[PDB]
Amino acid sequence: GRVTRRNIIWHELIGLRVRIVGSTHPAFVGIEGYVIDETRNMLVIAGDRIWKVPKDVSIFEFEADDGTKIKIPGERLVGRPEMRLKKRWKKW
């Protein structure tokens, strides 16, 4: 949906288009498609093939509904989707 570099931390990822722009393994850079599932440590991407990729060693580029491109290390998205959503709540 309407994701930004700031809220992507808690925002759901399923349904967003994504591109692996970096990785500890060069063979996987270039994988693109829509996120069809997310677990604590993985992202399931549906491209030409269905890929299950680890968040910790990948750099993602997500596309927001308005076309905006968002690049963020996958390590920052580690954690179950429901758990990440708790980060939306701020305690000052």
User: What CATH number has the domain bearing residue 29?
Assistant: 2.30.30.210
Domain range enclosing 55: 1-92
Experimental determination technique: X-ray
Burial track 60-78 (b if 16+ CB lie within 10 A, e otherwise): bebbbeeeeebeeebeebe
Tell the burial category of 20 from Cβ atoms under 10 Å away from its Cβ (0-12, 13-18, 19+): buried
Resolution (angstroms) equals 2.0
- For CA atoms 88, 34, 27, 42, the dihedral sign is positive
| Residue 56 DSSP code | T
Contact of 35 with 3, CB cutoff 8 Å: no
d(CA 58, CA 4): 18
Q: State how many domains the chain has.
A: 1
Longest Cα–Cα distance of the chain, Å, equals 45
Cβ atoms of 74 and 84 within 8 Å: the answer is: no
Question: Within 10 A of 41 (CB to CB), how many other CB atoms are there?
Answer: 15
